[PDB]
Amino acid sequence: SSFSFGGFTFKRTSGSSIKREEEVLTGNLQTLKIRVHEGYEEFTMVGKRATAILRKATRRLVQLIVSGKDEQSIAEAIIVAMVFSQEDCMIKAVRGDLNFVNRRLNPMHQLLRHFQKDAKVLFQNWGIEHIDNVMGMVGVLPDMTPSTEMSMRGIRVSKM
Numbered sequence: 259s260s261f262s263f264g265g266f267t268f269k270r271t272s273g274s275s276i277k278r279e280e281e282v283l284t285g286n287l288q289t290l291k292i293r294v295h296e297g298y299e300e301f302t303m304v305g306k307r308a309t310a311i312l313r314k315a316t317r318r319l320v321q322l323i324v325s326g327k328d329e330q331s332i333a334e335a336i337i338v339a340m341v342f343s344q345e346d347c348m349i350k351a352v353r354g355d356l357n358f359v360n361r362r363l364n365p366m367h368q369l370l371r372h373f374q375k376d377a378k379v380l381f382q383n384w385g386i387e388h389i390d391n392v393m394g395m396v397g398v399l400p401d402m403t404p405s406t407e408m409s410m411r412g413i414r415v416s417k418m
């Protein structure tokens with residue numbers, strides 16, 4: 259049971275979820291109704307220029323291991339994973355002048371379209387964490403600089 263989202267083919271490799279229609283608040287205090295997936299799941303994300311392993315719980319990204327052609331491809335996959343995770347810090351990153359969702363249309367696609375234009379606020383607001391040894395995997399900073407000390411929460415970059 260494969261599906262498509264933001265240019266990526268997702269395939270659930272483990273777990274399951276049930277859905278619940280829920281109301282969430284953006285950074286502009288706008289209410290959006292989203293279909294929340296409850297449960298722990300593991301996916302493969304296959305795109306034309308990046309691939310990834312995503313592990314998520316209800317509105318929480320546990321870990322994302324990304325591989326890709328370059329910084330832009332990888333960032334593109336990171337944006338989709340973050341939006342897909344349904345995390346509240348991703349929702350709270352929708353803010354400021356003109357940044358309102360036009361509310362039958364799917365709000366997940368609307369959130370994606372919003373962050374694809376500029377993921378600067380999404381990437382800042384996400385948070386950063388210290389990393390462990392794990393080699394062949396590097397941390398990535400909000401501005402896409404690689405680091406061996408720190409990375410955005412749960413985000414790891416693997417070599418192609």
Ligand SMILES: CC1([C@@H](CC(=O)O)Nc2nc(-c3c[nH]c4ncc(F)cc34)ncc2F)CCC1
Nearest residue numbers: 261262263275293295299341342343344366367
């Ligand atoms: C078109 C999307 C989504 C719409 C929906 O919820 O039915 N479609 C699917 N999501 C998930 C699915 C499974 N687990 C999920 N966790 C979060 C999440 F946003 C979606 C899922 N599984 C299968 C889907 F077809 C919007 C993101 C892809």
